Structure 1
């Protein structure tokens, strides 16, 4: 029916040129939801990504993947109703200052559970990065932005498409050879660096340069004051050879994760920190 009847927006929480995201309410139940509204008139090229995300999320049912509740059409606007996640993104939560290795290990663990779910459903996220990891106010950690996610089948054996964000992209994705879920494991290893240092490797460089640097160089390493097991976690992820990369399931039992990860509810203090930080200034 009419989405402006069914839903009420409470607060604009995100904005772009083609769309806006709100905190809002299902009026029938008073449930808080995320409401992403796309101006279909302005959307042009990225409309295929919108379609792809809706399709993939409608096929997902995991506590580690942002829920999709439906789409509504009202004039030039597409309303996409989604699980509200109010803690902020992992990247957002880096703003007030660095994470400790307990927080990092917990976040990576939860991402790994999400990747394990997706890969078992023969899906590939293909844009894993801290900005795409969204937290709930309880400290749950869930995956979002499925605009370029890919589907493996029997009609098509692997993927080829040059897609993702350059600094996080696997070398085999840059080369556009046949790749699979192991590409997400590379991106996860880059995300581990990003969680530790605040930025991905080569973050000051032009994206175009990174497209030849990533295949040309040895894999990035985590440098500085970070525990050996974290550096070995990064090292295992960022193997040039995908068949030598571990799976997400295996990584759940990496010693860095086992010795450092704790209950997700402990992440609420990371969210509190952001609230206080946000409020000031």
Structure 2
């Protein structure tokens, strides 16, 4: 999708006008791969929202950015980040979304050591989001700690649907090589027709992140790690004994090369390990401003 097609397509789906007519005090607080993030106040309520600003020109695979707004608009799930509106301002796409104070899960996995109560909490939240998404034919395709955001009270939400896809009876499988190298499913790296199961394998890699602090082969070049995930046996935990038999069995249902034998999200929700999931409050102590 080209710069012109991207803008033309967006004009048909975005909300009309400029959000500056109702949002005040824009302050940049960060960035992402496709743009920046500002916080702003809803003039009428004083409520805080996050605004993602993305240049229409300086982008890659704009079609995926377009699907992210089309597919995820009107989407509502307690474990999925909320999108309120979208607008075209100048040569930029502005997406007004929910502001989550807890930050991403990556900050936590690289600065502390989560316990099985915390991990099961994140897994349960992500799995609740995936079971609903997959049932509707939506595949996230970029599951990793960076894509998990936390609320101030410790609630877990799936974010960054920039690589998502929608499969249907018409087209039941995808073949695009998308995501982040270290978290990509083997059948996906292999360019084979794949389905929702790719998210389950990625989640498995995210579990290794929560346990060891990084995904497998993180010390290897991205293309090299991909070959190893694609051709070698499932990656293993360095701290294999640091986990309970419950978590080992859980992880063994995610990291299965043959997607047909890999567990689905709906099934995993019934897995024993998740019974150890603590409450939202158990996650709070992990956050930076609380460490």
Instruction: Indicate whether the TM-score tops 0.5.
Output: yes
Shift, 1:218, TM fit: 0.8
Residues 21/211 of structure 1: CA separation in 2 closer, same or farther (3 Å cut): same
Matched, 1:11 2:24: no
What is residue 227 of structure 1 aligned with on the other side? Answer: 244
Asked if the contact 1:221–1:234 (Cα under 8 Å) also holds between the matched residues in 2, the reply is: no
Q: State the secondary structure of the residue aligned to 1:13.
A: strand
Instruction: Identify the match of residue 286 of structure 2 among 255, 270, 278.
Output: 270
Asked if the contact 1:233–1:254 (Cα under 8 Å) also holds between the matched residues in 2, the reply is: yes
Q: State the secondary structure of the residue aligned to 2:95.
A: strand
Taking the TM superposition and a 5 Å limit, the aligned residue runs for 1:1-281 are 1-16=17-32, 19-41=35-57, 43-224=58-239, 225-258=242-275, 260-271=276-287, 274-277=288-291
Asked if the contact 2:121–2:278 (Cα under 8 Å) also holds between the matched residues in 1, the reply is: yes
Number of residue-to-residue matches in the alignment: 273
Structure 2 portions without partners, runs of 5+? 1-16
Structure-1 separation of matches of 2:131 and 2:25: 34
Segment drifting more, 138-147 vs 216-225: 216-225
Segment drifting more, 68-77 vs 176-185: 68-77
What is residue 7 of structure 2 aligned with on the other side? Answer: none
Shift, 1:18, TM fit: 5.1
Deviations 1:119-155 (A, max 9, x none): 0111000100011011111111111111110101122
User: What TM-score do the two structures reach when normalised by structure 1?
Assistant: 0.91
User: What TM-score do the two structures reach when normalised by structure 2?
Assistant: 0.88
Asked if the contact 1:56–1:146 (Cα under 8 Å) also holds between the matched residues in 2, the reply is: no
Asked if the contact 1:221–1:235 (Cα under 8 Å) also holds between the matched residues in 2, the reply is: no
Alignment RMSD, CA only? 1.7
Structure-2 separation of matches of 1:117 and 1:92: 27
Segment drifting more, 87-96 vs 179-188: 87-96
Deviations 1:159-188 (A, max 9, x none): 111111111111110111111111111111
Q: State the secondary structure of the residue aligned to 1:243.
A: coil
Structure 1 portions without partners, runs of 5+? none
Structure-1 separation of matches of 2:237 and 2:59: 39
Structure-2 separation of matches of 1:228 and 1:85: 33
Shift, 1:12, TM fit: 2.1
